[PDB]
A = this chain, B = another copy of it.
Amino acid sequence: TVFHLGVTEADLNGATLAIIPGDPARVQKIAELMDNPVFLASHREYTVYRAELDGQSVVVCSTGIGGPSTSIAVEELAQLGVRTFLRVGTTGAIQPHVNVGDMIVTTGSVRLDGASLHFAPMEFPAVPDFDVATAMKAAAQESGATVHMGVTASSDTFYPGQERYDTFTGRVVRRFQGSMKEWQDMGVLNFEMESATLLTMCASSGLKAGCVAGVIINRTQKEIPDHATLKETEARSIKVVVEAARKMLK
């Protein structure tokens, strides 16, 4: 019955934890890694499944791309009792030796977004819940993935805010010119688009959140991710996030 997600509290069957990928197509994939996956609804960028993990209900809900739709999903799920949010995403590596297929667990986000400011002023840290970050690190490491813990630059755009130049105008606004090297020099691991919003919103709202993402491109090489390695990277990331969910449930 929530405005956008089209699900009710009853639909969630007691779920207090959500796995929130960006891509609607990833929802079923994640759900099927758990028990009794059930399709709930799909409207706009929000595809929602429920499943069971060690006897506990878990909701899987896509967020779409971007802080704005992410913020809607988190809010509406929180309205229905969800308190823990595990983003599983795709990401571009900023550092040269973070490779495609590696997993990145965000310890803090550079807030290159707008939606985070709708929850807390810029000085507030876009930081994950410590339990979630711990669970994500553990799940990733236990899985045998190559895992990096660190800061993520989280941008409201895919193109200029991640300093991509292979674009229609080929221009990047002054603020973002040279930004990728600046973040690289500052030890920032990766770019994605939703963690600043997610982490700030949750950390300032009594919700627990984290972000783990599979590296699909190394930005020291090129701007557009290769298709060939997307599926395997995604499969690894969802294995990891489901295990992180297990760790959060008990």
Which residues of A are interface residues toward B (Cβ below 8 A)? 3-4, 22-25, 43-45, 64-69, 71-72, 75, 78-79, 105, 107-131, 133-134, 137, 149-151, 155-161, 167-169, 171, 173-176, 178, 182, 185-187, 193, 196-197, 203-207, 224-225
A134 to B161, CA, bound (A): 31
| Alpha-carbon gap, A150 to B206, bound state (A) | 11
Q: How far is the CA of A186 from the CA of B76 in the complex (A)?
A: 18
Q: Is the CB of B4 within 8 A of A75?
A: no
Q: Which residues of the partner chain B approach A3 to less than 8 Å between Cβ atoms? A: 158, 224-225
Of the A-B pairs whose beta carbons lie under 8 Å apart in the complex, a sample of 27, sorted by A's number, is A3-B225, A25-B43, A64-B65, A64-B66, A65-B66, A66-B69, A67-B114, A68-B68, A68-B193, A72-B158, A75-B159, A75-B167, A75-B168, A107-B130, A108-B108, A108-B127, A111-B125, A112-B118, A113-B156, A118-B155, A118-B159, A119-B157, A119-B160, A119-B173, A168-B207, A171-B185, A187-B204
Residue of B nearest to A206 (CB): B187
Contact A44 B23 (CB under 8 A): yes
Copies in the complex: 6
Tell me how far the C-beta of A156 lies from the nearest C-beta in chain B, rounded to whole angstroms. Answer: 4
Known contacts A118-B157, A167-B79, A204-B187: A111-B123 contact under CB 8 Å: yes
A176: B residues at CB distance < 8 A = 118
Query: Contact: A203 with B187, CB < 8 Å?
Result: yes
